Amino acid sequence: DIKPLYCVPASMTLLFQESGHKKGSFLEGSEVRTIVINYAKKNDLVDADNKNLVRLDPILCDCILEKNEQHTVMKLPWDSLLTRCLEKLQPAYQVTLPGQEPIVKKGRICPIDITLAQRASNKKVTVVRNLEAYGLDPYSVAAILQQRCQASTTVNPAPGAKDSLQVQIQGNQVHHLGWLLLEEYQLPRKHIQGLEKALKP
């Protein structure tokens, strides 16, 4: 139940101007499609000889083409035009947690990762990355899990490129994350990695 969205970047503002959507507006794919189709129709861009094709105007050339060769009409089929527009838009998505207003996020959807690891020769820990991508506060999750698991939790920087926090829980707690994420927060299973390593269903 996460909803994909598209965010209008500065480079595409002239395309979206007539539809009334500014830099930073969030749109569903179906809305982008309507807007782009209307732009082509309103600006008389449909190829008269082949109505499967759209002749790109300078605005479209500028914001979806890498190179605009001079004295050459650039034509794209409708579906290619729409695909390129969607690709050039910024990826985004919307998460709705139970009992709360929806939360918009910029970026590609990344999974929550739940991993078992060794902290010592025989001390297993559970490490949970990308909670914030789903609007979850690692400190809150850590507190909930410390009670649910009856095991110490900590919050630390997650190693890697992204400036994000991870939750660590002492012991093997993957099954408790299944409860928390799938049952309590109703998050989609397809966006969680590591639950298959739990002790039990």
Swiss-Prot record:
The keyword Electron transport is annotated on this UniProt entry: no
Protein's GO biological process: formation of translation preinitiation complex; intracellular protein transport; IRES-dependent viral translational initiation; ribosome disassembly
Signal peptide range in chain numbering: none
Gene Ontology CC: one annotated term: cytoplasm
Entry keyword set: Acetylation, Cytoplasm, Initiation factor, Phosphoprotein, Protein biosynthesis
Cellular localization per UniProt: Cytoplasm
GO molecular function: RNA binding; signaling receptor activity; translation initiation factor activity
Superkingdom of this protein's organism: Eukaryota
Keyword Glycosyltransferase annotated: no
Sequence ranges assigned to domain SUI1 in this UniProt record: 112-185
S-S pairs: none
Residues of the SWIB/MDM2 domain: 4-88
Annotated coiled-coil segments of the chain: none
Function as written in the Swiss-Prot or TrEMBL entry: Translation initiation factor that is able to deliver tRNA to the P-site of the eukaryotic ribosome in a GTP-independent manner. The binding of Met-tRNA(I) occurs after the AUG codon finds its position in the P-site of 40S ribosomes, the situation that takes place during initiation complex formation on some specific RNAs. Its activity in tRNA binding with 40S subunits does not require the presence of the aminoacyl moiety. Possesses the unique ability to deliver non-Met (elongator) tRNAs into the P-site of the 40S subunit.
Family that this chain belongs to: Belongs to the eIF2D family.
Protein name per Swiss-Prot or TrEMBL: Eukaryotic translation initiation factor 2D
Gene name of the encoded protein: EIF2D
